[PDB]
Structure 1
Amino acid sequence: RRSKIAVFDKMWTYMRSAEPSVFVRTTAEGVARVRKSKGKYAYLLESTMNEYIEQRKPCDTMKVGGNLDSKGYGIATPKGSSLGTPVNLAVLKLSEQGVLDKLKNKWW
C-alpha cells in the first residue's frame, strides 16, 4: 500500500483490480490454491516459512527469487529490567560461533 520505486505499484494496481479476488484470509488456503492450480498461481509469504513448507510432503513446491526487504526476529525484555543487557551480549556471542547456523541446519 505504501510501495515505491515504480515496480511494486504495478502489482498493487493489479491486485486492486483483478477478478475474482486474488487474496486469501488464511495461509493454508493460499497453500491449497497454489497446490491445486497446476502452477498457474503463486503466493507471497515470509521466507522463513517458505523454506520450511518446501521440506514437507508432498514436496511439490520450491522457493524462487531473492527478497524485497529485510526484517529480523529478536528477544524481548520488559523495559528497564536488569536481565536485558546480558542477553544482548549472549545473542552476539552465539552468532559469531556458528551455533545459530547449526541450529537452523538441524531443523530446516
Structure 2
Amino acid sequence: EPSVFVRTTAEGVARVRKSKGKYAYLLESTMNEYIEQRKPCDTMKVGGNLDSKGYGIATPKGSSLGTPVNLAVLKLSEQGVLDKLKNKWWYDKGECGAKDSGSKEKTSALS
C-alpha cells in the first residue's frame, strides 16, 4: 500500500526512474534486455532469472508444418542465427552499447 502494481510496462519503466531507485519492477528478461539498451539507459537488469520460460514458434495442432519448423529452429539455434539477430535487435539496434555496461566504474577509493 499504495499498489506497486502498475497499469502498463512503460509506466513501470518510468516509475522506477521517478522514484529514484526505491521502486524496483519485475518484468520478463528479454524485454528487460531491450529496455536496458534504450536511452536514457538508467534502468538495468540485476540477478539471475527467477524461472525458465521459453517462447516457441506455434503451429496449430496436427499441422504438418511444425516438424520442419522444429527442424528449422533447432538448426538456427545451433548455428547461432538467433544469437546474431539477438545481437542485432538488442545491442546493434540498442540506443546504448554492449560495453557501455563496462563503464559503470567499480569500487574505487576516495572520490
Comparing 36-45 and 24-33, the one that deviates more: 24-33
Which residue of the other structure, out of 6, 15, 19, is the alignment partner of 1:37? 19
Q: Which runs of 4+ in 1 moved over 6 A?
A: none
Aligned residue pairs: how many? Answer: 90
Report the CA distance between 1:54 and its aligned residue: 0.6
Using the size of structure 1 for normalisation, the TM-score is 0.78
Q: Identity, % of aligned pairs?
A: 100
Taking structure 2 as the reference length, what is the TM-score of the superposition? 0.76
1:37-63 Cα distance to aligned partner (Å, 9 max, x none): 111110000011111001111111111
Structure 1 residue runs without a partner (length 5+):
1-18
Matched residues in 1 for 2:13 and 2:39: separation?
12
1:25 CA drift (Å):
1.9
Structure 2: gaps spanning 5 or more residues: 91-111
1:45-95, CA deviations, whole angstroms, 9 ceiling, x for partnerless residues? 001111100111111111111111011111111122221211111111111
Q: Distance in 1 between matches of 2:40 and 2:26?
A: 19
